[PDB]
Write a protein that binds this ligand. Structure first.
Ligand SMILES: NC(=O)c1ccc[n+]([C@@H]2O[C@H](COP(=O)([O-])OP(=O)(O)OC[C@H]3O[C@@H](n4cnc5c(N)ncnc54)[C@H](OP(=O)(O)O)[C@@H]3O)[C@@H](O)[C@H]2O)c1
Ligand SMILES: Nc1nc(=O)c2nc(CNc3ccc(C(=O)N[C@@H](CCC(=O)O)C(=O)O)cc3)cnc2[nH]1
Ligand SMILES: [Mn+2]
Ligand SMILES: [Mn+2]
Ligand SMILES: [Mn+2]
Length: 159
């Protein structure tokens, strides 16, 4: 099973200038809980944005060019990325935009955080047909002293 996890601001913005400009600790905690002990697939730009291996997870990086760090696994195509995960119950795809586009048709589940923030960005989450997806979990949170925007965690499953 392939799942995508992402945090989206208004208008499906996911990034700007290879960064995420907001800071929502509660959402990073949700990201860690849902990815720990699973393989994570990311594109090269997202690898450079994170800047280090994510502990407790098999880190698989898509790039057309040879890898430059043996702490992670480098692959050259979608099919190779999936194969490098082995026989696990759930593969997590952690972006970015180009990678989400390629894995969306293959995904059975989306873990989405909707953030009530207006962000200029240059990267968007793919348009997804709403009729294909059933919302199985949602949880709304108001802003607090640690999280400066309201946010909604949602899990969707392909019908
Ligand atoms: N809000 C969120 O949830 C979230 C999550 C993740 C990322 N982001 C943001 O998203 C942005 C990065 O997204 P992005 O769309 O620019 O880049 P990306 O999807 O992270 O990476 C694209 C790169 O991945 C490689 N790639 C992708 N598909 C491939 C394939 N089929 N075969 C081989 N290599 C492949 C290529 O690397 P080469 O050029 O080396 O071939 C390509 O240039 C940043 O702003 C980041 O902060 C946000
Ligand atoms: N919901 C969601 N939020 C995100 O921030 C997110 N980020 C990415 C890609 N970028 C990043 C950037 C930083 C870390 C990070 O530092 N993670 C730590 C945080 C643990 C914690 O804060 O409790 C980790 O161990 O996962 C992960 C992914 C992909 N999907 C996402 N999905
Ligand atoms: Mn092939
Ligand atoms: Mn197998
Ligand atoms: Mn806001």
């Amino acid at each position: 099973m392939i799942s995508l996890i992402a945090a989206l601001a208004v208008d499906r913005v996911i990034g700007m200038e290879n960064a995420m400009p907001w800071n929502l600790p509660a959402d990073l905690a949700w990201f860690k809980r849902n990815t720990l002990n699973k393989p994570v697939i990311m594109g090269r730009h997202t690898w450079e944005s994170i800047g280090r291996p994510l502990p407790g997870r098999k880190n698989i990086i898509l790039s057309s060019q040879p890898g430059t760090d043996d702490r992670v696994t480098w692959v050259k195509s979608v099919d190779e990325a999936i194969a490098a995960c082995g026989d696990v119950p759930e593969i997590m795809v952690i972006g970015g935009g180009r990678v989400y586009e390629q894995f969306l048709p293959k995904a059975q589940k989306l873990y989405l955080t909707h953030i009530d923030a207006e962000v200029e960005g240059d990267t968007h989450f793919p348009d997804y047909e709403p009729d294909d997806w059933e919302s199985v979990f949602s949880e709304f949170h108001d802003a607090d002293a640690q999280n400066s925007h309201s946010y909604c965690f949602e899990i969707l499953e392909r019908r």
